[PDB]
Every structure is written in structure tokens, then in C-alpha cells.
Amino acid sequence: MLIAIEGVDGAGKRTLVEKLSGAFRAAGRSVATLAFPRYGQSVAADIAAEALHGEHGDLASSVYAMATLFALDRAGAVHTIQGLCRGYDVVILDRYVASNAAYSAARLHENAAGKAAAWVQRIEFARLGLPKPDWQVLLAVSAELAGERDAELQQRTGAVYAELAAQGWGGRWLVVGADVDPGRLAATLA
Amino acid sequence: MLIAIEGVDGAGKRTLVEKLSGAFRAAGRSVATLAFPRYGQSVAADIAAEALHGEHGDLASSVYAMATLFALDRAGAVHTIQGLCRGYDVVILDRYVASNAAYSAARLHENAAGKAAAWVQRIEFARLGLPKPDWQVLLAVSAELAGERSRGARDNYERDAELQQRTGAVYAELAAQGWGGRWLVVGADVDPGRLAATLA
Numbered sequence: 001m002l003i004a005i006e007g008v009d010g011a012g013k014r015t016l017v018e019k020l021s022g023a024f025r026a027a028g029r030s031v032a033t034l035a036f037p038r039y040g041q042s043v044a045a046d047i048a049a050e051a052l053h054g055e056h057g058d059l060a061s062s063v064y065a066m067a068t069l070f071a072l073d074r075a076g077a078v079h080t081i082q083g084l085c086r087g088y089d090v091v092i093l094d095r096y097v098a099s100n101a102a103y104s105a106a107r108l109h110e111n112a113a114g115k116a117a118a119w120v121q122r123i124e125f126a127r128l129g130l131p132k133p134d135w136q137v138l139l140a141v142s143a144e145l146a147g148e149r150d151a152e153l154q155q156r157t158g159a160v161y162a163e164l165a166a167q168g169w170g171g172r173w174l175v176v177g178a179d180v181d182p183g184r185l186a187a188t189l190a
Numbered sequence: 191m192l193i194a195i196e197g198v199d200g201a202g203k204r205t206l207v208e209k210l211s212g213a214f215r216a217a218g219r220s221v222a223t224l225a226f227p228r229y230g231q232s233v234a235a236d237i238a239a240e241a242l243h244g245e246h247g248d249l250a251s252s253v254y255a256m257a258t259l260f261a262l263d264r265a266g267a268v269h270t271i272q273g274l275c276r277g278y279d280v281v282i283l284d285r286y287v288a289s290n291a292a293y294s295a296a297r298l299h300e301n302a303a304g305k306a307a308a309w310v311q312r313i314e315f316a317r318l319g320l321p322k323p324d325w326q327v328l329l330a331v332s333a334e335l336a337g338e339r340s341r342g343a344r345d346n347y348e349r350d351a352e353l354q355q356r357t358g359a360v361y362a363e364l365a366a367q368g369w370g371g372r373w374l375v376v377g378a379d380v381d382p383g384r385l386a387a388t389l390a
């Protein structure tokens with residue numbers, strides 16, 4: 001089973017990944033995780049990060065260029081993902097293909113049913129061969145709550161996410177809070 | 191030996207690569223050739239091509255983004271360029287790192303002393319560790335003649351007549367200062383044998 005954990009930055013994804021992993025193991029299943037972007041593991045991911053820090057000229061000014069960088073990063077992890085999927089019962093990804101769909105649309109002031117989100121599916125899932133996640137778990141957080149733990153882009157990204165999940169973008173979604181009961185979540189995703 | 195053929199679009203590089211390839215084979219030197227972008231062999235390349243034809247939203251509008259896809263295309267070809275360099279006496283590349291430096295600077299109305307050229311330098315050679323070619327051969331040609339060759343669809347770069355002229359100008363500067371290594375500037379009527387003899 002392939003599970004993607006999605007949400008805005010500061011939503012609490014890294015932590016929810018561990019908890020959900022802990023719950024699945026307690027239930028007698030093996031679990032491997034992988035996080036994106038794979039900083040330090042792929043040039044695409046490292047250039048994207050740098051671009052976001054004001055490097056590489058006008059690269060960051062292009063929504064589709066940034067999106068492509070994050071996709072090329074995932075493309076280079078296909079062999080890894082396929083490996084984890086053959087060895088472990090559950091593979092949990094800290095951010096996946098929907099992160100590109102959500103942030104790209106938000107930067108373009110589009111919505112989940114827009115072109116950028118449609119484009120992400122055609123590119124990553126079919127052309128690059130990234131496995132479509134069985135479950136996409138949205139750790140939804142309001143703009144207000146996120147602030148506590150780029151606001152406008154972040155807020156709009158949160159909105160695209162809420163809609164992506166409601167529309168079953170790329171598959172079945174589940175919305176949860178950071179406090180969600182690990183054991184109940186694992187049982188629901190079994 | 192690694193030789194890179196450079197020039198603007200329609201300059202007639204493809205041909206020169208064939209002719210030079212022959213001269214080398216005649217002189218008893220096995221030759222292999224590779225062209226960039228490696229269409230059909232690199233998703234970065236394929237996407238770059240489609241982006242110049244108006245696809246992938248605002249991709250092509252970023253000078254550095256396009257340069258990056260090409261740089262990433264070549265990076266994923268490092269092992270191959272080395273595999274060729276080992277199995278043949280001469281490797282000929284149809285466009286290489288310099289293409290990226292000339293076009294990127296041209297798109298920015300910059301010259302060889304600009305940031306784009308230096309940026310290309312660091313990321314491709316230094317960071318990505320692309321093998322520096324022993325020879326960079328600039329195939330100079332008339333801007334009028336080159337443009338007509340292409341008019342006879344064309345992507346956003348080919349339709350840009352001023353881009354192609356600035357690209358030629360920057361190219362000449364690159365070769366003139368030995369950007370990235372030793373260059374050789376030739377005309378369309380250059381004799382293959384003579385050139386091959388010179389290069390090797």
C-alpha cells in the first residue's frame with residue numbers, strides 16, 4: 001500500500017508520518033518512509049531549493065519550471081519507491097505528487113480543478129511513471145493555525161488541498177488533524 | 191578526444207558533424223557522435239522541446255529554467271559521453287555546454303562577461319561535472335542564410351531573429367576568449383579533411 005502525507009509547511013506532516021508508521025508496525029506490518037523533496041539526494045531537488053532561496057536567476061519565477069524540478073526529483077526516486085513497495089507492506093511518503101498540484105495551482109491563483117493540477121497528473125503519473133498513491137492523507141490546517149505553527153501562497157495552497165481531497169484528485173483522500181489517533185488511522189487505511 | 195560542434199540554428203552543424211566524422215574515419219580513427227538535446231532519451235530534453243513550442247505553461251518564459259533542463263539533460267548523459275570516449279578515438283557532439291551559455295546570455299541581452307555565461311560555466315562543468323571538450327568548434331554562418339534555412343513549425347527560439355543574431359555574437363566572444371577550453375571557428379565551406387587533420 002502506498003500512502004502520501006500531504007499538507008502545507010508546518011502542518012505537522014513529518015510527525016504524523018512517524019505516528020502512522022508506529023501504528024502500522026504495532027498492527028503487524030512493515031513500514032518504510034521517504035520524504036520529498038529529496039534534498040541532498042538529487043540535483044533537481046537541490047537546485048529547486050536554491051532557486052527558492054534566490055539562486056539561479058529567474059528560474060523560480062516560473063511555476064511550471066519549479067513544478068518540473070520537483071517532478072524530475074520524484075522521477076529519480078521511482079526505482080526506490082518500487083523497491084520499497086516490493087519489500088514493505090506500507091510505504092509512507094512525506095509529501096508526494098499532490099504537493100506539486102497544490103502549490104502550482106496556488107501560485108497561479110487556480111483551483112484544484114484547474115490546468116496546473118491537471119498537468120501534474122499527466123506529467124508525473126503517466127510520463128514519469130510515479131505510482132498513484134492508494135491513499136492521500138491531508139493533514140489539513142487553517143491559515144491561522146498554520147501561522148501559529150509566504151502566508152498568502154500558503155493559505156491558497158491550503159485551499160487547493162482541501163479541494164484536491166474533496167475531488168479525489170489522483171485517488172482516495174482522507175482529511176485528518178495532527179491529533180488524529182494513530183491506531184484508528186492505521187485501521188482506516190488498512 | 192571530445193569535440194563539440196556549436197553554432198546558431200540552421201548554421202549547418204548536423205552536416206559538418208557528418209563530414210568531420212568521415213574525415214576522422216578515413217584517417218583511421220573510430221568516431222562516435224551524440225547530439226543535444228537528447229530528444230527521446232531524456233524527459234528533460236523532450237519537455238524542453240515541447241516548452242519551446244508553447245507547452246508546459248510558463249516554462250519557456252524562464253531563461254534559467256530552460257537552461258537548467260538542458261543542463262539536466264546533459265548531466266544524465268555523463269556516463270554515456272564517457273562510455274563513448276572509451277570505445278572510440280573521437281567523440282563528436284552536436285551542441286554541448288556552450289549552446290547553453292550562448293542562448294541563455296542572448297535571451298538576457300548579456301554578453302560573455304554576464305552572469306548567465308558564468309552560471310552555465312559553474313553548474314555544467316564544475317557542479318554537474320560534465321567532461322570539458324578538447325575542442326569547441328564554432329560553425330559561423332550568415333544570419334540571413336541561417337534564418338531562411340529554418341523558415342523553410344519553428345519554436346519560440348527559431349522565430350526570434352534577434353535572438354539568433356545575439357547568440358551568434360556571444361558565441362564569437364566565447365570562442366574568442368576560449369570559454370571552457372580551446373575553440374576553432376570555421377565557415378560552412380571548411381574542408382573536412384583539413385579540419386579533421388587540424389583537430390587530431
Ligand SMILES: Cc1cn([C@H]2C[C@H](N=[N+]=[N-])[C@@H](COP(=O)(O)O)O2)c(=O)[nH]c1=O
Pocket residue numbers: 009036037067070071095096097099100101103104
Ligand atoms: C515536494 C514539493 C514541494 N513543493 C514546494 C513546497 C515548499 N514551498 N516552500 N516554501 C517547497 C519546499 O517544501 P519542503 O519545505 O517540504 O521541502 O517546495 C512543491 O511546490 N512541489 C513539490 O512536489
